[PDB]
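Re: export button greyed out
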Amino acid sequence: NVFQTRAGCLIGAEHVNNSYECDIPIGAGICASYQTSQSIIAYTMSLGAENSVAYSNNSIAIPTNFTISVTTE
Amino acid sequence: QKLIANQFNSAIGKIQDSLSSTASALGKLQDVVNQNAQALNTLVKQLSSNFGAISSVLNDILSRLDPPEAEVQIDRLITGRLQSLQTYVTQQLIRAAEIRASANLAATKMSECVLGQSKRVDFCGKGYHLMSFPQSAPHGVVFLHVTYVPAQEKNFTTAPAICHDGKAHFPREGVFVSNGTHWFVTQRNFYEPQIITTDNTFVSGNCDVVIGIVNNTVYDPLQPELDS
Amino acid sequence: ILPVSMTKTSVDCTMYICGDSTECSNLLLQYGSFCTQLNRALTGIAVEQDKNTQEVFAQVKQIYKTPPIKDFGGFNFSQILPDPSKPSKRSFIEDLLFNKVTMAYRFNGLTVLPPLLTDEMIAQYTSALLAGTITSGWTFGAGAALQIPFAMQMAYRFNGIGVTQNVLYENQKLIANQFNSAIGKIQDSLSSTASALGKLQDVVNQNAQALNTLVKQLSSNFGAISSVLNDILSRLDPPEAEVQIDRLITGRLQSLQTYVTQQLIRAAEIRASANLAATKMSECVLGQSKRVDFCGKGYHLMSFPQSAPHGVVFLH
Ligand SMILES: *[C@@H]1O[C@H](CO)[C@@H](O[C@@H]2O[C@H](CO)[C@@H](O)[C@H](O)[C@H]2NC(C)=O)[C@H](O)[C@H]1NC(C)=O
Ligand SMILES: *[C@@H]1O[C@H](CO)[C@@H](O[C@@H]2O[C@H](CO)[C@@H](O)[C@H](O)[C@H]2NC(C)=O)[C@H](O)[C@H]1NC(C)=O
Ligand SMILES: *[C@@H]1O[C@H](CO)[C@@H](O[C@@H]2O[C@H](CO)[C@@H](O)[C@H](O)[C@H]2NC(C)=O)[C@H](O)[C@H]1NC(C)=O
Ligand SMILES: *[C@@H]1O[C@H](CO)[C@@H](O[C@@H]2O[C@H](CO)[C@@H](O)[C@H](O)[C@H]2NC(C)=O)[C@H](O)[C@H]1NC(C)=O
Ligand SMILES: *[C@@H]1O[C@H](CO)[C@@H](O)[C@H](O)[C@H]1NC(C)=O
Ligand SMILES: *[C@@H]1O[C@H](CO)[C@@H](O)[C@H](O)[C@H]1NC(C)=O
Ligand SMILES: *[C@@H]1O[C@H](CO)[C@@H](O)[C@H](O)[C@H]1NC(C)=O
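Workaround output, generated via the alternate export path:
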């Protein structure tokens, strides 16, 4: 099972038109992950999830509540 | 206060479960320890390489040959090993600076983040920063950044200004909002509506210039206080 | 203008040294782990290059996109926002940049690996970062983005620098024109002079520089009778040709460590420059900087990231 990429000739991973988070970085946006039986896949990495802020010149969103997170660095 | 306590205390508890099963979060440290022992290993293996000479054992070249030949061979040993040091050494210098570059980054976080409160954004991690707690780790340091992240939002109609008598009123701190009827001024990073009075707002200009000013009535603390 | 990543290269040590010759290839084994530790070295570079580009550009959890209709109060971002009519969507400015900056080395072994993130992706980040900066203020770096009227954003960014917000809303129209007319000249500043991008241009050159040098080292005798690895094998009986090929190998094998060490040192500079970007990107773009002349001369209001080849460009 062969597929042609931007980064070269890939073998043994079924192409996927869907696009998910980059998991195992390959090259030029192609990122592979294991999950679906199962087979290694290859797909164009989605950079981020998509959002569109709902914006209008009078529209403001002020947080009513908060969290306190402890992030190890 | 109480609600912030549990949010803090629980958020601590998550850390200890993270690191408990997490080998990767220390990858930065684990890599540094590795890469040294790596080049240290490779430095050692280079003692087993011929480098073109007839053997990699120093004496076994000697006792095989009469020394005036060994003087030639031991070159290709020395020329080899001496090089392999300068490779390893020049590595360490480069790698040392890399750590040196991360030491400044730590010694700055230690200074600014721990000992201060960092106005810098995302220097101490995502969210507005409250405090950090350093924790030692082998050949490294681990900060626990306590950061303030807002959560629940509510769409609000807002206005940059409010006419009263034709004067313009602007908030000292925060912004005029309304849920659609009553105009409230509130602080920015938390929703805490308050009725709009002169103590909330200062006067500047008049009603022509501002783009987006909206009619309203700014209540006066003082006026009722008079009426007796 | 800042460099961010440098061209990711990976060299085949056994081939680059010994072309198509087991005779030479066997000798290389007698130097041990040099061949392997070079790949271990260059991979360390090549890996973190896509870590640099990772740290800089993607600090944002989600990809925001500008609203369909642009009313910012008079500020015209069509210059800096993604161009909906280009096949690769990149803001009008970024095209000015990609024009300025610009199997040869692959024949030997120097294979130029593709950067993990395609340029079109880089332009989606710098769209997001720029989409959230415009609509959501600075809050999108601290959590969920919060839509706020852009003109009510700039009232804060004046309070940041100590100018009371009543200045803005009174001067808004004026400030609009000064902004727009300032953006325009950024085009010609880039359009009419090719030396502004020298920082990037220098990085790209020095990389392609050493590669040329590294290649030309193949043609040097290094004391051996010829620079063609086969000629030494063709003319001479091997027992002597062994000593000859050493001077080639010793020469070439050294000549890699020279090149490798340069890349390590040079990458360590980029690694430092990358953090400077990631620092600006976080503090300057995502927040508002109180650090005098860190974001560039003057009191700082906001910054607009723009991608450039193996680099990044901020509009302060
Ligand atoms: C702010 O959010 C916190 C949760 O993060 C809320 O606290 C929870 O409130 C519910 C009641 O609806 C309790 O059952 C939970 O035990 C509380 N959690 C904790 C950790 O104490 C809080 O009520 C929210 N406050 C506002 C004003 O929205
Ligand atoms: C917006 O918020 C204000 C402030 O609470 C609301 O005004 C109050 O609404 C409650 C409704 O339960 C009344 O009992 C109070 O008498 C109101 N007080 C004032 C000063 O108006 C208002 O109803 C809210 N409107 C919306 C659409 O949410
Ligand atoms: C705010 O209120 C003022 C009056 O308090 C409004 O002014 C009126 O504007 C219209 C539009 O031309 C005039 O025909 C009226 O004569 C004005 N009123 C007076 C008393 O002169 C103004 O339009 C309001 N604006 C907003 C945005 O609410
Ligand atoms: C923002 O500026 C661009 C150009 O900098 C404007 O696009 C121009 O629009 C006029 C329409 O009057 C055309 O005649 C020009 O040919 C356009 N130029 C380009 C390069 O597209 C755009 O209209 C401006 N928009 C805002 C909201 O200010
Ligand atoms: C993706 O969809 C196209 C049709 O648009 C199809 O030709 C292609 O085979 C699909 N890819 C995979 C991996 O199924
Ligand atoms: C604010 O309005 C937008 C409009 O699309 C909506 O998606 C969003 O959920 C609203 N905010 C909240 C807190 O529901
Ligand atoms: C805000 O935008 C709307 C368009 O949806 C327009 O009708 C209104 O006049 C604008 N108000 C201001 C203050 O710009």
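The longest strand of chain B covers residues 140-150. The button fix ships in the next patch.
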